[PDB]
Design an enzyme around this catalytic site. Sequence first.
Site, PDB file in Angstrom:
ATOM      1  N   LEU A  52      -2.822  35.089  28.491  1.00 33.36           N
ATOM      2  CA  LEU A  52      -1.764  36.235  27.855  1.00 33.36           C
ATOM      3  C   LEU A  52      -2.151  36.579  27.036  1.00 33.36           C
ATOM      4  CD1 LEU A  52       1.649  34.530  27.416  1.00 33.36           C
ATOM      5  CD2 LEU A  52       0.465  35.114  29.505  1.00 33.36           C
ATOM      6  N   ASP A  96       3.646  40.507   8.603  1.00 34.55           N
ATOM      7  CA  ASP A  96       3.944  41.664   9.686  1.00 34.55           C
ATOM      8  C   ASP A  96       4.197  42.100  10.824  1.00 34.55           C
ATOM      9  OD1 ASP A  96       0.922  42.370  11.179  1.00 34.55           O
ATOM     10  OD2 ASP A  96       1.337  40.368  12.086  1.00 34.55           O
ATOM     11  N   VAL A 113      -3.308  33.067  23.322  1.00 39.82           N
ATOM     12  CA  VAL A 113      -2.138  32.326  23.686  1.00 39.82           C
ATOM     13  C   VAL A 113      -2.373  32.179  25.540  1.00 39.82           C
ATOM     14  CG1 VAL A 113       0.789  32.494  24.170  1.00 39.82           C
ATOM     15  CG2 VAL A 113      -0.985  32.822  21.997  1.00 39.82           C
ATOM     16  N   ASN A 125      -6.556  37.417  16.296  1.00 39.60           N
ATOM     17  CA  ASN A 125      -7.978  37.396  14.999  1.00 39.60           C
ATOM     18  C   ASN A 125      -8.044  35.907  15.076  1.00 39.60           C
ATOM     19  N   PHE A 126      -7.340  34.673  14.958  1.00 39.22           N
ATOM     20  CA  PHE A 126      -7.214  33.261  14.808  1.00 39.22           C
ATOM     21  C   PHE A 126      -7.373  32.625  16.124  1.00 39.22           C
ATOM     22  N   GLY A 127      -6.023  33.103  16.970  1.00 34.31           N
ATOM     23  CA  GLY A 127      -5.230  32.771  18.175  1.00 34.31           C
ATOM     24  C   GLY A 127      -5.471  33.110  19.187  1.00 34.31           C
TER      25      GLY A 127
HETATM   26  O1  0X5 Z   1       2.999  34.979  20.525  1.00 33.76           O
HETATM   27  C1  0X5 Z   1       2.512  36.454  21.347  1.00 33.76           C
HETATM   28  N1  0X5 Z   1       2.901  36.502  22.905  1.00 33.76           N
HETATM   29  C2  0X5 Z   1       3.610  35.765  22.979  1.00 33.76           C
HETATM   30  C3  0X5 Z   1       4.553  34.900  22.974  1.00 33.76           C
HETATM   31  C4  0X5 Z   1       5.259  34.340  24.180  1.00 33.76           C
HETATM   32  N2  0X5 Z   1       5.700  34.383  25.435  1.00 33.76           N
HETATM   33  C5  0X5 Z   1       4.836  36.096  25.328  1.00 33.76           C
HETATM   34  N3  0X5 Z   1       4.707  36.583  26.812  1.00 33.76           N
HETATM   35  C6  0X5 Z   1       4.080  37.225  27.654  1.00 33.76           C
HETATM   36  O2  0X5 Z   1       2.926  37.674  26.806  1.00 33.76           O
HETATM   37  C7  0X5 Z   1       4.401  38.377  29.098  1.00 33.76           C
HETATM   38  C8  0X5 Z   1       3.505  39.443  28.890  1.00 33.76           C
HETATM   39  C9  0X5 Z   1       2.756  38.201  29.642  1.00 33.76           C
HETATM   40  C10 0X5 Z   1       4.231  36.741  24.694  1.00 33.76           C
HETATM   41  C11 0X5 Z   1       1.589  36.861  19.857  1.00 33.76           C
HETATM   42  C12 0X5 Z   1      -0.141  37.339  20.998  1.00 33.76           C
HETATM   43 CL1  0X5 Z   1      -0.732  36.707  22.316  1.00 33.76          CL
HETATM   44  C13 0X5 Z   1      -0.862  38.156  20.110  1.00 33.76           C
HETATM   45  C14 0X5 Z   1      -0.382  38.856  18.727  1.00 33.76           C
HETATM   46  C15 0X5 Z   1       1.468  38.705  18.481  1.00 33.76           C
HETATM   47  C16 0X5 Z   1       1.985  37.647  19.528  1.00 33.76           C
HETATM   48 CL2  0X5 Z   1       3.593  37.464  18.848  1.00 33.76          CL
END
Ligand code: 0X5
Length: 300
Positions: free
Chosen positions: A23, A144, A31, A27-29
Site C-alpha cells: 500500500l 501532522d 504499509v 519516510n520511516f515506515g
Molecule cells: O496508513 C496509511 N495508509 C493506510 C492505512 C490503512 N489503510 C489504507 N488503505 C489504502 O491505502 C487503500 C488505498 C489502498 C491506507 C498511511 C501511509 Cl501508507 C502513508 C502516509 C500516511 C498514512 Cl495515514
Amino acid sequence: SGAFEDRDPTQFEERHLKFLQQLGKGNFGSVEMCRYDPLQDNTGEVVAVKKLQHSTEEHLRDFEREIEILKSLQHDNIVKYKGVCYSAGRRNLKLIMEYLPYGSLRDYLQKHKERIDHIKLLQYTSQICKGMEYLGTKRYIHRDLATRNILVENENRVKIGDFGLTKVLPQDKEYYKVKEPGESPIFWYAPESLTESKFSVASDVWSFGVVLYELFTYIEKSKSPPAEFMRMIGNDKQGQMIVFHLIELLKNNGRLPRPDGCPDEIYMIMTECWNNNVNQRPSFRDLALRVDQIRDNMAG
Ligand SMILES: O=C(Nc1ccnc(NC(=O)C2CC2)c1)c1c(Cl)cccc1Cl
C-alpha cells in the site's frame, strides 16, 4: 502437538498473516494489506500492517510510542488499532490496524470527484473536528494534519491516522516544543511551530484550517498549499530562503487564497484558524458545532 489458549486477540501470529498487497512506503515506515487467516481456510479479516524500514533504538522507541497512542484511541473517526505482530521469530515488530479501502482523503478527492460535493466535504470536515476533539481529551497533539494523513473508509466516513508524530501534553503545560532533524510539512505549520517548534492544540487547529483549504480545492493541480505558497513566495526560491519567506509572509497576514467555488463562510473558518494569535483560534468543539450547524441549516 500441544494445547493452546488465546487470551490476547491483539497479538497476531506471523504465520497466519498473509500478504495481499503493498500500500505505501513513507519516510520511516511502509504499509501492506494482509489477510489474517488463523483457520487456514483462505478467509480472514483484511488488515493494514505497518512496518519500520530500520529498527534503530530510536526508530523502534518511536514506533512503540506510536502504537501505544493508537491503541489508546477508540473513536469513529480515528483509525482502529487491531494489534501487533512480533514477526521474524519475535525479533521484529509490526503494527496491525484497520484497512481503509479508499486510502487517503487526498487521493480520494483527486480520484473520485464524481462522488464529492460540498455536503460531503462538510461531513468530512465535521468528522475530522470530532476526531480531533477526541485527541484533545487525551492531551494528544497530532502535529501532522493533512488530507494525505486522513483516510477514507467509505463515501460517508473518514478517519484520522498518521500518529507517528503525536505528542502528549504534560498536565501542567499547554504546548510541546519539539526540536527535530530533517524535513517538516512546513506549509501546514502554524507560525509558532515554524519559528519556535511549538506545537499545541492551537497549532493543530491551524493545520486543520489548511486541511479545510485542501478539501475545497479538491486537490487540484495548481492549488495545493505547497504550490500556492511557492507562487506567493517565488517559485525559484530554495532551501531556507523558502522558510524565511514563508515565515515573514505568514507573520504579516499572507494567507492561502479562497478556493474557487468556496463559500465565504467556509473561507472565514479557514481564516479564523489561521490566526497568528494562538489563543484566538477557535477550538475543535467550536469548529464541529459551527460546521454541523452550517450543515443542519441547509434545506436538505
Ligand atoms: O496508513 C496509511 N495508509 C493506510 C492505512 C490503512 N489503510 C489504507 N488503505 C489504502 O491505502 C487503500 C488505498 C489502498 C491506507 C498511511 C501511509 Cl501508507 C502513508 C502516509 C500516511 C498514512 Cl495515514
